[PDB]
Each structure stands twice: as C-alpha cells, then as structure tokens.
Amino acid sequence: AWEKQQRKTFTAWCNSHLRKAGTQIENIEEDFRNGLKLMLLLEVISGERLPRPDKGKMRFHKIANVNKALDFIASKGVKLVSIGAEEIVDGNLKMTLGMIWTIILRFAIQDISVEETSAKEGLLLWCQRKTAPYRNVNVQNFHTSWKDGLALCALIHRHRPDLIDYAKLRKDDPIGNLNTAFEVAEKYLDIPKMLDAEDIVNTPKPDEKAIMTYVSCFYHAFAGA
Fold first, then answer.
1. Coil, helix or strand at residue 35
2. Which domains occur in the chain, in start order?
3. What is the DSSP letter of 108?
4. At the top level of its lineage, which domain of life is listed?
5. Torsion sign over Cα 12, 174, 105, 27
6. What are phi and psi for residue 113, nearest 5 degrees?
7. Contact at 8 Å (CB) between 207 and 143?
C-alpha cells in the first residue's frame, strides 16, 4: 500500500515542477532511467544549472546522467545510501521512490523553519498553528490526522475563507471533504492533485511521506502570499 501512494504522489509532485520546463513523466519507474528528466527536475527545483547531459542512448550514458543527478544531490548535504545509478537506470521502483523522497525532503521540506522547529517537525507545527481554531480538527501527525479531510480543508480555510464553506463540512463525509480540498487547491492554488481520496480514507495509516509531500505544497503556496 505504501508503494501505490508514493508512486502516485511522488509522480504528481515531480510533474508539478517539470511542467515549468515544458515536460512531464507518466511512469516514475521508467521515465527517469535515462537521467534526463531527473537532471531537469533538479534544475527546476534548485534554480541552479547542473552539468550538461551526455550525448548518446547507450546504457553507460544513462548511468553518467543519473550520476550527475546523484552527485548534485550529494553536494547538497544529502547522504545517499544504497542508491546506485545502475539500479536507477536498469529499473528499481523502490530505489527510485527512495531517491525521489530524498529530493522532496531536501528541497521542499528540510529548510522549513517555524518557531525554532525545522523540517518535518516544523511543517507539522505550522499545520497545527493554522488549524488550531478548528475544533473538529486535531493535527498530531502526517497520517491518521488527515484521513477525514477536515485538516486540509481547515488549512485552506485559514488562509482563504472565501474558498471553502467550512461550516458545511461533516466528519462523516471524508471522501467529499478530501475532494473538496483537492479541487480547490488545484483550481485556485495551482497545487496539482497528488493524493487519492479512496486510499487516504481506507488505509488504516496513510503514507506520511506522500502526505508530507502534498502538504509541503500548501506551505510554499501560502508562504509566498
């Protein structure tokens, strides 16, 4: 169950950035094998220029491109473990998802700082501060606390009360609450849908890496304004 959620969410997150470079991926376990869109993804999110990609379709050129991507990530303090270019190139879903998570964590979550609290813990505190006024919400983690959709709706309502009629939302309509939040974020906040409502409501403990990935988009979207 963790793999399905991470595949959907990580793919959508990558696409939310790749669109700025005029491209997209579809199958995360295949579309980064030659390293080209992986290098592009890193340039988009970092605002920096990576080395030029290799010229050639041979397997060793793909390995070289993936190594350029991995070396860049490592230069940002990321300690790559077990992740090898050969595996990314030949195909390994688990390793690929692990690599993309390290990227999401380093570039979208690690530098978040709220009240002397950083990264994951800081993002959580931010969510707690924003949803404090809502009695039917209780953010205590990045999994079960988000299952009924009220926390996400509240997070949006706190910044944009004009976008959601919070009083109409009921805890017994989790799918509806989640979709309402997903739709509003997509249409008005330019945050692509990254979570599947059914998976969130039916999985006892939803994947927190996927939820953190999606929620981090709201932090950055609201941090600007």
1. coil
2. 1-112 (1.10.418.10), 113-225 (1.10.418.10)
3. I
4. Eukaryota
5. negative
6. -140, 120
7. yes
Structure tokens of 217?
Answer: 């988009």
Give the pair of three-digit tokens for residue 108: 């979208």
Q: Are 25 and 18 in contact (CB under 8 A)?
A: yes
Half-sphere exposure of 55 (CA within 13 A, CB side): 0
Cβ-in-10-Å burial (0-12, 13-18, 19+) of 47 comes to: exposed
- Helix (H) or strand (E) run with residue 199 in it: helix 197-202
Resolution of the coordinates, Å: 1.6
Q: How far apart are CA 126 and CA 200, in angstroms?
A: 21
Instruction: Judge contact between 191 and 220, C-beta under 8 A.
Output: no
Amino acid making up residue 130: K
Non-local (6+) Cβ contacts of 73 within 8 A are 42, 80, 102, 103, 106
